[PDB]
Scaffold this motif. Structure first.
Motif, PDB file in Angstrom:
ATOM      1  N   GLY A 280      58.483   1.352  50.609  1.00 37.24           N
ATOM      2  CA  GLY A 280      59.236   2.369  51.277  1.00 37.24           C
ATOM      3  C   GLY A 280      58.900   2.594  52.779  1.00 37.24           C
ATOM      4  O   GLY A 280      59.519   3.327  53.482  1.00 37.24           O
TER       5      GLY A 280
ATOM      6  N   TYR B 134      58.319   0.303  56.075  1.00 37.25           N
ATOM      7  CA  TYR B 134      58.575  -0.840  56.866  1.00 37.25           C
ATOM      8  C   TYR B 134      57.600  -0.963  57.970  1.00 37.25           C
ATOM      9  O   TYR B 134      57.727   0.207  58.805  1.00 37.25           O
ATOM     10  CB  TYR B 134      60.021  -1.034  56.888  1.00 37.25           C
TER      11      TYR B 134
ATOM     12  N   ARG C  40      54.625  -0.954  58.886  1.00 35.80           N
ATOM     13  CA  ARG C  40      53.569   0.137  58.886  1.00 35.80           C
ATOM     14  C   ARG C  40      52.322  -0.444  57.899  1.00 35.80           C
ATOM     15  O   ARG C  40      51.650   0.288  57.144  1.00 35.80           O
ATOM     16  CB  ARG C  40      54.077   1.534  58.053  1.00 35.80           C
TER      17      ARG C  40
ATOM     18  N   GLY D 157      58.037  11.599  64.337  1.00 32.76           N
ATOM     19  CA  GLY D 157      59.025  10.991  63.628  1.00 32.76           C
ATOM     20  C   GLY D 157      58.957   9.393  63.267  1.00 32.76           C
ATOM     21  O   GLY D 157      59.765   8.752  63.436  1.00 32.76           O
ATOM     22  N   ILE D 158      57.546   8.913  63.061  1.00 29.01           N
ATOM     23  CA  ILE D 158      57.368   7.465  62.573  1.00 29.01           C
ATOM     24  C   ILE D 158      56.653   7.539  61.366  1.00 29.01           C
ATOM     25  O   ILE D 158      55.636   6.657  61.162  1.00 29.01           O
ATOM     26  CB  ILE D 158      56.878   6.786  63.662  1.00 29.01           C
ATOM     27  N   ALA D 159      56.930   8.402  60.349  1.00 31.39           N
ATOM     28  CA  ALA D 159      56.453   8.421  59.028  1.00 31.39           C
ATOM     29  C   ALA D 159      54.666   8.709  59.364  1.00 31.39           C
ATOM     30  O   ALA D 159      53.863   7.864  58.664  1.00 31.39           O
ATOM     31  CB  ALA D 159      56.540   7.211  58.106  1.00 31.39           C
ATOM     32  N   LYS D 160      54.321   9.484  60.127  1.00 30.40           N
ATOM     33  CA  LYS D 160      52.848  10.062  60.343  1.00 30.40           C
ATOM     34  C   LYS D 160      52.613  10.829  59.353  1.00 30.40           C
ATOM     35  O   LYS D 160      51.149  11.112  59.328  1.00 30.40           O
ATOM     36  CB  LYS D 160      52.809  10.789  61.893  1.00 30.40           C
ATOM     37  N   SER D 161      53.236  11.563  58.853  1.00 29.44           N
ATOM     38  CA  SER D 161      52.854  12.732  57.464  1.00 29.44           C
ATOM     39  C   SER D 161      53.017  12.009  56.210  1.00 29.44           C
ATOM     40  O   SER D 161      52.449  12.540  55.216  1.00 29.44           O
ATOM     41  CB  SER D 161      53.705  13.711  57.800  1.00 29.44           C
ATOM     42  N   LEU D 162      53.618  10.853  56.139  1.00 26.72           N
ATOM     43  CA  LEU D 162      53.794  10.611  54.662  1.00 26.72           C
ATOM     44  C   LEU D 162      52.519   9.488  54.524  1.00 26.72           C
ATOM     45  O   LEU D 162      52.289   9.340  53.076  1.00 26.72           O
ATOM     46  CB  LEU D 162      55.004   9.540  54.581  1.00 26.72           C
TER      47      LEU D 162
ATOM     48  N   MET E  21      65.065  -0.167  55.936  1.00 25.46           N
ATOM     49  CA  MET E  21      64.587   0.956  56.156  1.00 25.46           C
ATOM     50  C   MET E  21      65.378   2.330  56.169  1.00 25.46           C
ATOM     51  O   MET E  21      65.296   3.327  55.685  1.00 25.46           O
ATOM     52  CB  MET E  21      63.666   1.167  57.180  1.00 25.46           C
TER      53      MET E  21
ATOM     54  N   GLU F 156      59.861   9.433  48.507  1.00 27.60           N
ATOM     55  CA  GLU F 156      58.662   9.501  49.137  1.00 27.60           C
ATOM     56  C   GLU F 156      57.762  10.461  48.430  1.00 27.60           C
ATOM     57  O   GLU F 156      56.601  10.306  48.999  1.00 27.60           O
ATOM     58  CB  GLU F 156      58.675   9.692  50.777  1.00 27.60           C
TER      59      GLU F 156
HETATM   60  N1  LIG Z   1      58.767   3.603  60.484  1.00 27.40           N
HETATM   61  C1  LIG Z   1      59.229   4.099  59.334  1.00 27.40           C
HETATM   62  N2  LIG Z   1      59.357   3.327  58.248  1.00 27.40           N
HETATM   63  C2  LIG Z   1      59.861   3.786  56.938  1.00 27.40           C
HETATM   64  N3  LIG Z   1      60.261   5.018  56.636  1.00 27.40           N
HETATM   65  C3  LIG Z   1      60.065   6.075  57.674  1.00 27.40           C
HETATM   66  C4  LIG Z   1      59.629   5.542  58.937  1.00 27.40           C
HETATM   67  N4  LIG Z   1      59.516   6.696  59.828  1.00 27.40           N
HETATM   68  C5  LIG Z   1      60.015   7.810  59.187  1.00 27.40           C
HETATM   69  N5  LIG Z   1      60.141   7.289  57.768  1.00 27.40           N
HETATM   70  C6  LIG Z   1      60.500   8.380  56.544  1.00 27.40           C
HETATM   71  O1  LIG Z   1      61.001   9.463  57.048  1.00 27.40           O
HETATM   72  C7  LIG Z   1      60.617  10.528  56.455  1.00 27.40           C
HETATM   73  C8  LIG Z   1      60.223  11.996  57.099  1.00 27.40           C
HETATM   74  O2  LIG Z   1      59.082  11.224  58.069  1.00 27.40           O
HETATM   75  P1  LIG Z   1      58.231  12.374  58.978  1.00 27.40           P
HETATM   76  O3  LIG Z   1      57.279  12.900  58.228  1.00 27.40           O
HETATM   77  O4  LIG Z   1      59.399  13.367  59.710  1.00 27.40           O
HETATM   78  O5  LIG Z   1      57.449  11.229  60.029  1.00 27.40           O
HETATM   79  P2  LIG Z   1      56.608  12.144  61.016  1.00 27.40           P
HETATM   80  O6  LIG Z   1      55.523  12.665  60.434  1.00 27.40           O
HETATM   81  O7  LIG Z   1      55.984  11.054  62.000  1.00 27.40           O
HETATM   82  O8  LIG Z   1      57.448  13.188  62.005  1.00 27.40           O
HETATM   83  C9  LIG Z   1      59.489   9.904  55.245  1.00 27.40           C
HETATM   84  O9  LIG Z   1      59.783  10.319  54.138  1.00 27.40           O
HETATM   85  C10 LIG Z   1      59.364   8.402  55.619  1.00 27.40           C
HETATM   86  O10 LIG Z   1      59.891   7.971  54.402  1.00 27.40           O
END
Ligand SMILES: Nc1ncnc2c1ncn2[C@@H]1O[C@H](COP(=O)(O)OP(=O)(O)O)[C@@H](O)[C@H]1O
Lengths: 481, 52
Positions: A19, A21, A23, A47-52, A177, A184
């Motif tokens: 889930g 990509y 990364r 907004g680059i999956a920094k919290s997931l 993606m 998630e």
């Molecule tokens: N580069 C990425 N590849 C795959 N999924 C992503 C990516 N960036 C964001 N997401 C998806 O977006 C959702 C929300 O991310 P988010 O927590 O807002 O990121 P950030 O913490 O960088 O703001 C996550 O559940 C994640 O699966």
């Protein structure tokens, strides 16, 4: 037993990348710091999956509690660690395995002062007595960079791993993606790959017992001095170098190795930099050492030049056997036209040796490489000719002339004659030194083909190490022709 | 010949009852008042009671 550990580590990170990509370098980096007691810093736009990634590493452990919080300018320590009544810290920071602090470059002074004691000591001030904190992984993400002279520089110097994440760039990886049905917030890690609390405490003791070879430490022995003579190089203190050994020893422990490997030094590209200016200097200085002094790439290049210089020295010493005869031609012409050898010489940028060396342009020379396109015009029409010295530099003018025995005489500033000669159609001494250098290239290439399968190594870096090793093997094969 | 060392890291959570010794009259056996060489790392972060 040690070889089977690399299979479980490679299989654990495979399920965590489901889930996410582009990364792979962000998940494998956080897994190494979670199993070693280090930290990881993330930098990039929000907004680059920094919290997931902070919520996915908690699934690798059997008993792990996550904590997500955003540091604000008016935040109080009673909301992060827990409010007091003696402090209600149930489910916060002192009793959390993985904590996430978003935007750390804007918190209050009371939170920054207490965050420096929870890393070096892993303790918390619970009113009167102190208690340990089982923090296994500390991740911090933001967007901007702190000031060069502020109180936020104390926390940045303690964070080992500093990653610079960004958005996706590949078109094929963006379609999968954009349309992903994987949850998630679910658990995509099997129970057989989840580590326990006993395996985490046992791995912390085996990390410090990793043997440190003397040849692998030679890379840091020279790379450290390179970051001190340049004014644009970032300042790396001794505290950063001491924490880098724990990350390098743990990188080879989970890859099926007992000692530190030279390939584990690529992880330093995300630990020595601190801003946008140091990123282009750290990634450039490491790439030179990884493709030069690592697998004896540059060490064999300077040794190959000595064999070529020794071969040219033996050729100019035995030049008395083969001379240089210039044939004549008839025809009707006002000037004495001369012709070169037919099938005996066919190269354009051929080289011509000489007997007694002279001092041309305030320097010595052992061979003069002429041009076949300009030699035909000088031997027929006449005039002046040009030619470089030692096969380098610009084509300087020389005092070339014909002799009575159909030879080429090169004069200098003292009117000294020197008959030119061409090299004949490999000595035993040159073949002996070339065979020993070729054996070292095959032994060094075998070490790279036995440790490149590490999980904490990027994929794009393998294309530069293989291309650098093939360049050294291609240059030694041309001299034995 | 008779020198007692004292290696203690000066932290912001440190109290005067731990560096010099806790009281019962003060159990200062092997601390600061009876030490030949004392080492205090990071002194620019202690409390006002320990600095005085
Ligand atoms: N580069 C990425 N590849 C795959 N999924 C992503 C990516 N960036 C964001 N997401 C998806 O977006 C959702 C929300 O991310 P988010 O927590 O807002 O990121 P950030 O913490 O960088 O703001 C996550 O559940 C994640 O699966």
């Amino acid at each position: 037993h040690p070889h089977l550990l690399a299979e479980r580590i490679s299989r654990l990170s495979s399920s965590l990348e489901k889930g996410l990509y582009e990364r792979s370098h962000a998940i494998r980096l956080c897994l190494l710091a979670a199993l070693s007691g280090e930290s990881v810093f993330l930098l990039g736009p929000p907004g680059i999956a920094k919290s997931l990634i902070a919520r996915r590493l908690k699934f690798a452990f059997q008993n792990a509690r996550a904590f997500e919080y955003l540091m604000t300018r008016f935040s109080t320590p009673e909301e992060v660690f827990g409010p007091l009544s003696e402090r209600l810290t149930s489910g916060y920071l002192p009793e959390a395995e993985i904590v996430f602090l978003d935007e750390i470059w804007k918190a209050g002074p009371a939170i920054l002062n207490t965050l420096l004691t929870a890393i070096n000591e892993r303790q918390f001030r619970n009113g009167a007595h102190v208690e340990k904190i089982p923090m296994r992984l500390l991740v911090a993400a933001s967007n901007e960079l702190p000031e060069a002279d502020s109180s936020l520089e104390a926390l940045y110097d303690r964070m080992l791993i500093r990653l610079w994440l960004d958005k996706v760039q590949d078109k094929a990886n963006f379609r999968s993606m954009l349309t992903s049905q994987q949850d998630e917030n679910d658990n995509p890690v099997p129970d057989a790959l989840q580590v326990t609390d006993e395996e985490y405490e046992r791995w912390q003791k085996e990390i410090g017992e990793i043997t440190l070879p003397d040849h692998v430490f030679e890379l840091i022995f020279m790379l450290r001095q390179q970051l001190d003579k340049l004014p644009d190089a970032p300042y790396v203190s001794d505290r950063r170098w001491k924490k880098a050994i724990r990350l390098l020893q743990a990188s080879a422990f989970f890859s099926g190795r007992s000692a530190v490997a030279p390939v584990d030094l690529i992880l330093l590209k995300d630990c020595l930099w601190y801003d946008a200016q140091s990123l282009n200097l750290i990634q450039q200085q490491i790439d030179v050492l990884m493709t030069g002094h690592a697998w004896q790439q540059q060490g064999m290049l300077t040794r190959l030049g000595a064999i070529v210089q020794r071969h040219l020295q033996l050729q100019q010493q035995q030049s008395d056997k083969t001379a240089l005869t210039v044939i004549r031609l008839g025809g009707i012409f006002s000037r004495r036209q001369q012709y070169q050898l037919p099938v005996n010489v066919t190269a354009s940028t051929l080289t011509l040796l000489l007997q007694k060396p002279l001092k041309l342009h305030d320097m010595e020379v052992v061979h003069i490489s002429f041009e076949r396109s300009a030699l035909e015009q000088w031997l027929s029409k006449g005039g002046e000719i040009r030619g470089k010295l030692n096969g380098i530099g610009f084509a300087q003018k020389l005092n070339l002339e014909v002799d009575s025995a159909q030879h080429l005489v090169v004069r200098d500033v003292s009117l000294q004659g020197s008959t030119l000669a061409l090299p004949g159609s490999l000595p035993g001494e040159i073949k002996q030194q070339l065979e020993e250098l070729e054996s070292d290239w095959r032994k060094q290439h075998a070490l790279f083909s036995e440790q490149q399968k590490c999980l904490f190594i990027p994929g794009d870096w393998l294309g530069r190490i293989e291309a650098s090793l093939q360049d050294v093997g291609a240059q030694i094969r041309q001299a034995q022709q």
